[PDB]
């Protein structure tokens, strides 16, 4: 039939694909290609337009499975195209050996890392949910799609996979269909050696509805009636256990060596006359199988048709709500949004800067509708909570609404990461945050890096970020944390003295488009600074106390600015002139102008760090650092900084060091380099 | 009764350090202080000799719960008191606001990130296991001891649990029993915001037995009755599901805010007069439960002393078992087992840094008794079984025995790093080893830091390092992570270039007593370097090729030492002298000597980092740093380094522009600084 032509085809083309490599995973996409066509049969898209908001998701947690991935792209005419198979794996091309939403036409997010693709979904669906109760009205479904997540084996093994099911399960969420690659085999060979849960009884604990699938290898009929029975389940996510053959159809099917590398060129002969292609021939596509698949895209499309025009009928008749979701599918924020921004002047009092924050998502959540976020069992301590919002919840259970916007995402730090990129991934213009401590923002690493990666604008509200949280003690400080997530690639560190610098920090992460956001807060109060302003603070460093004379400047973060405009009155009184710079995103202030970057940190000067956690990276502004490259204490905070000489006294002491240290030396800017 | 006295003395203990600290948890400590006098009157365990072998073990993973634990060992008479108790959470105390086994005696490991102490309690009991399948004997139960655990709602919700708890149950665990305090609050109020999943249902899925106590505040009885039960199953952990009300007791109880804050005063006078204690008084400590827990101590203590002489007994009846165990306890390593390890010459081939792993574990694993180790699901690819092992699995599967060697920790890399720090707490020598990726290394992030605070040698097999992995593309490819791990303290992070290098990070892991190690591994063939060594690599840092007329020196690590070598040999046709200086391990370079470090890194002379990673840290050895701060990409691997110029020729002409920028300049060492 062609329904088997084309099965055959996508499989032979992942062969091929992972042939011509030399290099890939040939397994898991002949396992799963009788389940993508009969999904993709199902799934509502447009090849011709990536964006379409009331598409159907595809997301492929198991990613290394993405020859698959690719070979449906390319046999539904997205973007990709059989040329671009033979370039799978190779430097530059369309097809990277795991999928990245930058560069792969159809890729929703970027998965590879397993267990991330599922919570990824998870997001999605979240979204999609939201996005609904928001905007759906009598007559007008204007969101009404599915996420769909292949996983495999792997991402069922991953803890974030299961806070996120654990997640989804309480949400209700019902959009969502997973289907489980239960093909038995890992790297390390059968799943008996490591993993012999009851997978499904498990699913069925957290709440989501199961359909098994017993032969999948062949039965696309059963796959589609278990999505038909799935969406009949509207209040449960479901899990589709499809038993699978590895390697289907392989001389090496069914063994963990047909896995990860390609199949002997006598496998691919086999593989080809058994399901009567012509051995001698690579990358086959059957025009009757592009016929199949061009006649479903053609009906899509002209759903989509549909679907513009019943966008146009709501604008006339929810004429605010509809031009709220016009300017949101435009990638726009609301005109003026930044006016909300909170502004504090010198003679205001001190706040910590979760309070500010607390403060400035109070002020923008109400003007800004496409902000929703939430806290892993923080939401006291984070302070990321406005008043007089609801929770994100199913309305069954009375505790919140589908239209809330507060997400209660438990102590699930990993997987709120992951759930954060699929929101993102929706679209829409969503801008949405999570809060924990600083400190377990680590924990969710796996999926921050994907986050920066992925370019997504997503916030994390990272409290309590030093040795200034106090009692809880070394196990809570961070000390690394920021080193770590300013040495990733395209995330922005922001760590905010004072008011003006917090409404700055968050103007930057709500207009963001394609960069991740931390924001580093403190548990302490801190003093409101004189020179410093919004304007000043969105360049990531400024001057905030100029000194023509400087014998020294000092440049610092977060609670350390005031702790160094402290230190510039001791110093005075040692004869010794300082100016202070505060450099609130380090990311933000290597993107402006050398010239810029050069006016805060000038030639000719000794220039001092202080930021009372690692030194790492710090090079890069000063001469000499002045950090915290040890763990902390468990004692009440003010303490600990006198511990660790953290004081006014202390930073002059060191201060007045580094000018004796550079006497007789000619100083240059630490922005210069050889190369 | 003494009972309800003991059960109330341990309440007020640690409600008034809370309240002395006016910062700490009484709402667990209460609801658990039932389950925590019928655990420990259940525990073999010596005040006085906290290492004893076959002792059991307790750990409390809910650690913010740490009130309660320091009230069991203060009323026990370990080395802590009813003085350290006042000084609860205060700066320097034995009594720190979480537990740190390096500081409170009785601690075994260090908790308060959630999640972490069940993982590592499925750690100590692995341990046992195998400790007991290597050395028991018929008439010797050398080992015989279980391993107690508490948990709350937050462990159950992190991921790293659900991972660890799904292996726990696949190894049938049986020694290992786990309490979750069911008291259905978190901070943000009631589970049934967040958390409704049906836990039990799900710890069955993993195998577990299970227990309820519905009446936990009170039922004694039944808690003991649950320990003897899980005691009587031997092939599956047990969880005890303890019903309990959080703050029990208090005008609070049942309520998020007894969770996390100080009682009031007046609340704590009604518990004390509820209660039969004087509301006047402070820290009271009845001498009638002193009485009864000093009777259990002193029978605890023969059972001691019976096991010392079962010990005298063994060495006899098995001479050589015997005297290994004797070794093991007293903390040493063989004589001259580093003898084992494999030296190269610059004749011998190339071989990838992975491979020479493999080789080293091969020689040294049939050396050394102590060491076990494995691999979460990537074993053919970090190479990390020795040929002719055995694994650990239950005889019931037949794929192990509980005496192997090698664990198959399936995708769960979080969890592996916490059992492997619950192995290394277990003690007896063990020298304990986790392979995955260096890229994924990083979702086990929250144990791989308590693997430094906690002090413990464990060690990860950390392959596939760089861009030099290839194809898997960028998703895969470490950039941040080596300055993640070097900005963390006590985190050895060794990246050896060839095989005498490969020996000495060995020598380091294995030797280690107090810090976890990182090993950097490649997947590509490196060269033997002229002039490596076991001895000059063991220093952390030397001095590879030395030029007494260097016009710069290049510093690097791993596979860029090859490349640093190769670009010497350009630079002299250039007219450039350059010397190169290896650092496979920065941590154990900065232990050594002043004078040693200045002799690799001497004044007078630029030096230029290069390492195919973040450049941050760099500075601290180096004047100018050639990294790579950008995600990788998706080819072959040597088209991937000659895309981003790591190549001789492009570290030669960042080299020169080093020398050029420095023409005039007087140049000291990195090493020195102001301060
Ligand atoms: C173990 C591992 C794999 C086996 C999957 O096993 P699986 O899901 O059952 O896949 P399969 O049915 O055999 O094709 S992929 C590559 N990887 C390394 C890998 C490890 N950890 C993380 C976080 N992401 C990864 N990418
Ligand atoms: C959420 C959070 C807590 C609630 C526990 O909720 P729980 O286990 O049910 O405890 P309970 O019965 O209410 O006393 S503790 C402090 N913490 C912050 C916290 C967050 N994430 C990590 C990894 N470790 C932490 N330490
Ligand atoms: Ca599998
Ligand atoms: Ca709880």
Redesign the interface.
Known sequence: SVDQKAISTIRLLAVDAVAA?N??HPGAPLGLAPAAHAVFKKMRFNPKDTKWINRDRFVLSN?HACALLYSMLVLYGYDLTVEDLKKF?????KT???P?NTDVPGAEV??????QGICNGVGIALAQAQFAATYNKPDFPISDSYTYVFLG???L???????AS??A??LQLGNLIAFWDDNKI???GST????????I??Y????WHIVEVSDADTDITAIAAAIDEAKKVTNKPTLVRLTTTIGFGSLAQGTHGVHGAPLKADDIKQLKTKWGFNPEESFAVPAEVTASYNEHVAENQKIQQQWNELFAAYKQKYPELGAELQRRLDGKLPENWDKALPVYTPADAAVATRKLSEIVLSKIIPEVPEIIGG?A?????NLTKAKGTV?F?PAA?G?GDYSGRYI?????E??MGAIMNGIAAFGANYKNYGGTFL??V??A??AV??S??SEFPITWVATHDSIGL???????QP??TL????????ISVWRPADGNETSAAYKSAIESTHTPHILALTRQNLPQLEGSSIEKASKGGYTLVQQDKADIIIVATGSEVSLAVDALKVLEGQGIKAGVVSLPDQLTFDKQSEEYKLSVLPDGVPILSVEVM?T??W?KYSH?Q?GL???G????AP??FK?FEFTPEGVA??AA??V???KG??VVSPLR???
């Open positions: 490599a290099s890939g990613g794996r190779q430097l530059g091309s990277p050996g795991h990245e970027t998965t590879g890392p397993l267990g084996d792997g991402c093994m991953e803890g974030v996979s299961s806070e654990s997640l399960g309480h890992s790297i390390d008996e050696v490591a993993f012999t849960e009851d997978v009884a498990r069925k604990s957290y709440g806290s069992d923080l939401t006291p301590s929770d919840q259970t505790l209660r995402y438990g102590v699930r990993h997987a400190n377990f680590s924990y690493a796996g890096r994907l920066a990666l106090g009692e809880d003690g070394p196990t809570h000390i690394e080193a770590h997530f300013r040495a990733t690639p395209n690692s790492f990276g090079s000499q002045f490259n040890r763990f204490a468990s004692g009440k303490e600990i511990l002491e060191r060091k580094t004796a240290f550079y030396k000619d380099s050889a190369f």
